[PDB]
Design a protein around this ligand. Sequence first.
Ligand SMILES: OC[C@H]1O[C@@H](O)[C@H](O)[C@@H](O)[C@H]1O
Length: 397
Amino acid sequence: APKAEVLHWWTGGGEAKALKVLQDEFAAQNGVWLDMPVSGGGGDAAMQTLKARIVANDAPAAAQIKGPTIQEYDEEGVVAPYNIDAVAKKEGWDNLLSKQVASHMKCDDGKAYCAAPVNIHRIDWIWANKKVLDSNGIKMPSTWAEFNAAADKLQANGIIPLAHGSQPWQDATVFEAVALGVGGNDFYRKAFVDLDAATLGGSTMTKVFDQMRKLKGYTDAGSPGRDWNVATGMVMEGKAAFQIMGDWAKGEFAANNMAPGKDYICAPTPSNNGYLYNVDSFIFYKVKGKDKVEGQKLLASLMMGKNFQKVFNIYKGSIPARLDVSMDEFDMCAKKSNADLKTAGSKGGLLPSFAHGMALRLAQKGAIQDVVTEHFNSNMSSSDAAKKLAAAVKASL
Ligand SMILES: OC[C@H]1O[C@@H](O)[C@H](O)[C@@H](O)[C@H]1O
């Protein structure tokens, strides 16, 4: 009987509802799922539990993982042999995924698939409670200046403008979206892809921290330590106007029967045809036993299934990684995501989220998040923040 231990951080809400599609498909194929959930938004907690399980030679069969962390484990030598690469080849994953997604999924210097992608999340979203914006005569903002004007108006009317939880990854999520709009595509690429010292520490970055300082004043006293899905719930219930968060938030809206255009408004954060992508993927470790290897090969195949990725993503709030899945049954926000992905692609605006593990190894992600969260939760000047950011990145290299 095919078996797999699966380590992930999808422990409630729209996340669990989407995961259930995969768990149900696996059991239907007589697969035995050993659940290994590790609660913690953005997966930093999962990454700590995973790391300790590997260093202890107790690798799970499959683990939720992002981008360069895949290759980091590969370089450890804990992944090969690449038993799922045979699945990938037979099914022609190379013609079903974008060059960029495909490259993320490979081990052995780009030669063998060792992880399966299920989706593409987008980071650069604003979610708004529609009755709140209508009640206050506010149009969904398209610029930070429109957002700040709207936030002042809502605050003066006694409404929390921005529902947010201040945890390091969650502060970084807002930050990266802000950076893309305040600085632009090349700036974002230079800072978080190239790690250009001048760009990190310079005047455009200062302006990013200026906008972070504004956003802090729009949050509420319960923010520190708050989980992201609590913040989404605040918008859902009209206890706050806005949330700036990836489209896993749309998993919550959908799971509570709210619809874009009727109960809430989804609009990208300001950018110049930018798109910040995030691919949930599962790596398959070197594991002992033929039943576990059959588990891995079965999971890989299911995760890349055509119908699966349609259904999973409708619930999850993301769009399919698979290039040939019909977007037709998806909502307005997912279609905007798909469209903007194609549009950003051609303009050089399609960029990896760093806060969600696609741009950078965890060491570089950690270094940045820690400075961002320190600025956000203190009275640090924007200049000082940018100087500290550049230095922490530099020291992390
Ligand atoms: O925890 C909130 C989100 O964290 C992301 O990094 C992950 O890719 C999403 O699937 C969702 O789980």
